C-alpha cells in the first residue's frame, strides 16, 4: 500500500531531523562548533490522468490526478557565523575573528582544517591540538621560555632570559575556502575539503579577507537553543501526526481484509 | 502462463553505522563508517566484525 | 550527500600553570617560588 510507504518516509524524515537537533544540543559547550540545519525535499509525482483542458466557459475544476511519493532529506547545511568569545586566560588559546581555519596533519598524511583553537606544547616542543594531532605549519617552542605571545597577524614570538627583545619562532597562517559550507566534517572538530568546496588557499591573517587572531580567547559554538526547542516541538507533533496517518490506513486496510 | 509463486529472500545486510555510547572504558573501540575488526573464527579462517 | 553527528565526549583536561598570588606566613621555612620550576 502506497500510504504505508509514504508515512514511513515521513517518519524517517522526522527521526533524522530529531537526530540532527539532538546532535546540535548535545555538544553546545564545545568550542568552535557550527550548528546544522537539515533541509528536506519532496520526491517526484506520478500523473495518472492528464488534466485535459475544457475551455467551455463552464467554470469547471481541472480534472487531473497527480499522486505524490514522499519526502527525503537532501542536505544538512551548517551556518558559519561568528560565535561569541570566551576568555580562558591561557597563553596558548587563539580565537579567529572573521573566517579561516587552522591546518592540522592527520596521522595518515592527509590534512584537515579546524576552527577550534586549543593548542598545547608536546614533549618535543611542537605545538599540537588537544588530542595529539600537530599543527601543519610546524611551529616549535624552545624550552626555558619566559612567556609566549602570538601576534594579531599570526606571528608567534617568545621572550628569553635577557636580550630585552622577543625572538620570533614562527608564523601562524591559516587557510580559506571559497564555499566553506561544503566541507565534510569528521570528529575531533575536523573538516576536510571535498569537491563541494574550492581548493584551499593559505594566507597570513589580515590579508585576502582572512580574520585576525586573539590570544587567550576561544570561540564558543553558535547554537541558539531558543529555536532548537521550537524545532523539537514541531518534530514531535509532525511525528505524532504521521503515526496517526499510519494508524488510520492500517485500520481501513484491516476493515478491507475483514471480508 | 498465469501462476507465479512468491518466495522470501534475504540480502546480506545493511551496514549503516549504529549509534554509539561513551563508556570511558579504556579498551572500548568504535570503528569508522566502513571499518571492520578482524578476529580468528572457530574454523581458523579470519572473520570480520564491529 | 549529507552528514549526521553522533555526540560529544571529553578529550582532555588542561591545567593553567599561571602565577598565583602570594600570602605571607611569617614562617622561616615557607618558600614561595616565583616563575617556573618545581621542588623534587
Walk me through the topology.
This is part of a larger assembly, with two copies of chain A and one copy of chain B (50 residues).
Chain A: H1 2-26, E1 36-42, E2 46-49, E3 65-67, E4 71-78, E5 85-87, E6 94-97, E7 102-105, E8 111-114, E9 119-121, E10 127-129, E11 134-135, E12 147-150, E13 155-159, E14 167-171, E15 174-176, E16 183-186, E17 190-193, E18 201-203, E19 212-215, E20 217-219, H2 225-258
Helix pairs in contact in A: 1-2
Chain B: E1 37-40, E2 46-49
Antiparallel strand pairs in B: 1-2
Family (chain B): Belongs to the flagella basal body rod proteins family.
Subcellular location (chain B): Bacterial flagellum basal body
Protein name (chain B): Flagellar basal-body rod protein FlgF
Question: How would you characterize this protein structure?
Answer:
This is part of a larger assembly, with 2 copies of chain A and 1 copy of chain B (about 50 residues). In chain A, about 20% of the residues are buried. The two termini of chain A are about 20 Å apart. By secondary structure, chain A is an alpha+beta fold. In chain A, a hairpin with a 7-residue loop joins strand 13 and strand 14 (about 165-170). In chain A, the strands form 9 sheets. Chain A has a 3-stranded antiparallel sheet, with no helix packed on it. Chain A is built from 2 helices and 20 strands. Helices cover about 25% and strands about 30% of the residues of chain A. By secondary structure, chain B is an all-beta fold. Chain B is built from no helices and 2 strands. In chain B, a hairpin with a 5-residue loop joins strand 1 (about 35-40) and strand 2 (about 45-50). Chain B is elongated and about 65 Å long. Classes of the chains: A alpha+beta (about 260), B mainly beta (about 50). Chains in contact: A-C, B-C. The interface of A and C includes residues 36, 38 and 90 of A. Chain B: It comes from Salmonella typhimurium (strain LT2 / SGSC1412 / ATCC 700720). Chain B: Belongs to the flagella basal body rod proteins family.
Amino acid at each position: 500500500i502506497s500510504s504505508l510507504w509514504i508515512a514511513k518516509t515521513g517518519l524517517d524524515a522526522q527521526q533524522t531531523n530529531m537526530d540532527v537537533i539532538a546532535n546540535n544540543l548535545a555538544n553546545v559547550s564545545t568550542n568552535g562548533f557550527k550548528r546544522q540545519r537539515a533541509v528536506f525535499e519532496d520526491l517526484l509525482y506520478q500523473t495518472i490522468r492528464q488534466p485535459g483542458a475544457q475551455s467551455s466557459e463552464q467554470t469547471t475544476l481541472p480534472s487531473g490526478l497527480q499522486i505524490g511519493t514522499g519526502v527525503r532529506p537532501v542536505a544538512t547545511e551548517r551556518l558559519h557565523s561568528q560565535g561569541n568569545l570566551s576568555q580562558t586566560n591561557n597563553s596558548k588559546d587563539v580565537a579567529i575573528k572573521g573566517q579561516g581555519f587552522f591546518q592540522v596533519m592527520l596521522p595518515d598524511g592527509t590534512s584537515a582544517y579546524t576552527r577550534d583553537g586549543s593548542f598545547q606544547v608536546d614533549q618535543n616542543g611542537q605545538l599540537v591540538t588537544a588530542g595529539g594531532f600537530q599543527v601543519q605549519p610546524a611551529i616549535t617552542i624552545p624550552a626555558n621560555a619566559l612567556s609566549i605571545t602570538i601576534g594579531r597577524d599570526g606571528v608567534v614570538s617568545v621572550t628569553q632570559q635577557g636580550q630585552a627583545a622577543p625572538v620570533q619562532v614562527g608564523q601562524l597562517n591559516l587557510t580559506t575556502f571559497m564555499n566553506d559550507t561544503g566541507l565534510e566534517s569528521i570528529g575531533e572538530n575536523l573538516y576536510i575539503e571535498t569537491q563541494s568546496s574550492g581548493a584551499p588557499n593559505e594566507s597570513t591573517p589580515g590579508l585576502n579577507g582572512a580574520g585576525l587572531l586573539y590570544q587567550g580567547y576561544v570561540e564558543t559554538s553558535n547554537v541558539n537553543v531558543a529555536e532548537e526547542l521550537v524545532n523539537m516541538i514541531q518534530v514531535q507533533r509532525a511525528y505524532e501526526i504521521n503515526s496517526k496517518a499510519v494508524s488510520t490506513t492500517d485500520q481501513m486496510l484491516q476493515k478491507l481484509t475483514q471480508l | 502462463a498465469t501462476r507465479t509463486l512468491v518466495t522470501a529472500s534475504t540480502p546480506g545486510a545493511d551496514m549503516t553505522p549504529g549509534q554509539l555510547d561513551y563508556t570511558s572504558r579504556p579498551l572500548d573501540v568504535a570503528l569508522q563508517q566502513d571499518g571492520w575488526l578482524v578476529v580468528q573464527a572457530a574454523d581458523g579462517a579470519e572473520g570480520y566484525t564491529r
